[PDB]
């Protein structure tokens, strides 16, 4: 039967980028033609593979990651990028194989009084590895004196809220991202086009 | 032995539409992805669009997105490019290109010969052809002057005279029209015996001119 | 976007020389790097795909190497027909395919003297109003040649425009056509119409002239 | 790519008045991205308000911000002499950006200057140069005229002027005019004088000294 | 006791290089967003560069390819290497914690250090007294120095009321000159010593001039 890409794309609620969702897709026939030629995507970029080639390829597992970020930040969901998102929230490898798909979700994810449910990690000691997920909410120590879980000077809550309002500039409006990763092991493939 | 034949290029005004076609042969056309690539006069190569084997998936470069349209008829083995709202920057030679299918990624293994698209609000004027009579061999030729736009095809003796022919690139004189020179060197012996006629053809203005060149 | 930087922009090499072209990428593009050859007026042709794979039918004197950000195209033995402009193109970002600036390869050869011919304006053209004086330099090398118009021993500049053919696939020589355009009123005003040529293959400047209506 | 524009360029108000500074944006910027900074003369900028309306630590209660979308406002409720500074708005899109800044000049009543003239020191004379300094101390408004007279001869071309910023405590200006001559030229004349005209003076004020006495 | 203390400013020739320093106390440089903001003479603020705690670096378009931001954890200090400097790089450079984004604003700020890009040379100042005659006036003339700045205090900072230090004026010779004055009651002239403390930072020229009557 068919791979369930719709449960990822058509989902009514999306994850925050720091707690990005991953759906592991296995043991199914993937119909990329219908998936791609569907909604209108403001961003569609593939690396190491053509979108029109996926129907001929077989993979051991396929990963579909999804989250929400700012408009100005979509450029960071790409190989070899840096910034608050790529460093501290969601990181693709330099040799990334797969596709990044983004579309404006201002009608669904912004609120008149500001949507503060979507967050991104603002402070972190070091950068994330590729495909690493950090859901910690420990107070960030920006100075010498420890925090002991109490916010204060040099002691910051690690996550910040976007506050999406429906009439912000497009650079500040929420965008829904889906990232398709294609895992090729030396094992029998379970996903073919 | 894979062939791609383009057609449909010509003259078009800013804001108007035009449709280019690409007929494929001698390979399983309905199972390969097809591309359009263009090259503005004197500039480099720019990828334009791609279409999937079944025509379902289409992808465009940012410079023509929402403005051009790519399509294909697999029963006719023809690739199409629909160009609307043509700006001055769209003036280029448009190639179609077969993929290759040996990689996971796009590349261009076979190219079409390209067709020229000139976005302009000028008038398609036919060329004027004048001889260049000769005065230790000799040289004679023809002068294609005051025509627009590119190109003009010049042969000698309807394609029989090949060796020793030099057709110079056109030059855009101050009048906005083009001026072209085509010469051919022949032995000074056969000058009043052999006949020389240059074959000028200007498809944009539909002009075919044969001129006698005698000393 | 991924930018492809090709160096050098242009190079001169003689037949039989080893030619190497360098293409650099703004970021790692794995091995998806392809090379194309484009003759003057002709469509590009694929030489190498995936950094080092030889396309079917391409001569063996072509090869490629490299990975990450630095890639190379090599012509082990330059042939005369190898005169063209050579492009690299990255295929790692498949929906934003970008090309390099291109490297124009020119064939270096021995000095060839130009054959100068001068043509008076035709009688069919004088009936129209304009008059063009054509001067032809044929089968010379190198391209650098000075064409000087002299009307009644008066130096002319700004009335003409030159045109050079691309390097010949046979003997690797150039050719030039200078078209001295002027009205009919300026034509009968003078008598002498000369064409002076200065070239590296000439021990002294050569001039081909004619007198109006003689 | 979101450009911000501050208005007005300069603001002239009296102590105790209400100061309204605008920061307009081409596109609508969320309020949590807007900040205000204060820079006093010769000092580093200081953070006043962040998030459009949240006051920074230790900032007096008279400073307040508000607005959203394309129009942000910084308000100085009760204006004080020490509030003389330049105020910048600042936001982040793809990179940090600063507005052009708005200058807040403080209005004051007329004040005539105290005029002083200083002869060149003997230590400088030995080096071959004489600098004669005329001081105009604590005046308002800024417009003043200083004229050097050497032996009753008006001088031009050999003097330079410098004015302080508005004083942070009394909003007055101070001016310094320096007459420069060679030691040789300085010994040739006896009476050095600078004539000062100002709105606060009913008649021009002249301050002079005689070389030697 | 939070501070950012800058150093490394002064005179540098066009096309030269210079490294600024920003020593921190009360915060950890390697654990914060750390930025550089600069201010050309008489102009507004301009963000220049930022280093993230994770190591990422970003630069304004006006400095890309010429500036490099860095830090030293053991010295808890931020740096800015400035290469290929020109006249548009002449400014007061501030360091600051933060990036100017929500939850991450520029706070605190360094005191600033002035960088002067010119082909001139460093000259120390000469300090001369402005000797007085209800209230009197006295001061110090600081003449012929380059580049900026000089700072002047009075009685080692114990005298601040009524001090006016004028902005420097560029003399026709290319050296700056300023004056610092203070107004005091006339009775204290004979029973209160007045010293002006001049500090020309680019040359470390510290001069203390007692201003007595004559
Ligand atoms: C999402 O739902 C629409 C109908 O509401 C359907 O047409 C579309 O195919 C769905 N998307 C996917 C990826 O299944
Ligand atoms: Cl809103
Ligand atoms: Cl088929
Ligand atoms: Cl194939
Ligand atoms: Cl907000
Ligand atoms: Cl400069
Ligand atoms: Cl941000
Ligand atoms: Cl100074």
Numbering used by the authors:
A (entry chain E): 334 to 526
B (entry chain H): 1 to 135, 142 to 221
C (entry chain L): 1 to 214
D (entry chain B): 1 to 213
E (entry chain A): 1 to 133, 140 to 220
Original authors' sentences:
S is a large type-1 transmembrane glycoprotein that assembles into homo-trimers (Walls et al., 2020), which decorate the outer surface of coronaviruses. S1 is responsible for target cell engagement, while S2 completes membrane fusion, allowing the viral RNA access to the host cell cytoplasm, where viral replication can begin. The RBD interacts with the cellular receptor angiotensin converting enzyme 2 (ACE2), which is expressed on diverse cell types, including cells in the upper and lower respiratory tracts, allowing SARS-CoV-2 to cause respiratory infection.
Rather, it seems that there is little binding energy in general from the CDR3-H3, since most of the binding energy contribution of the heavy chain comes from CDR-H1 and CDR-H2, which interact weakly with RBD residue 417, meaning that many VH3–53 antibodies are likely to be resilient to the common N/T mutations. Residue 501 makes contact with CDR-L1 of mAb 222; however, the interaction with P30 is probably slightly strengthened by the N501Y mutation, which provides a stacking interaction with the proline, conferring resilience.
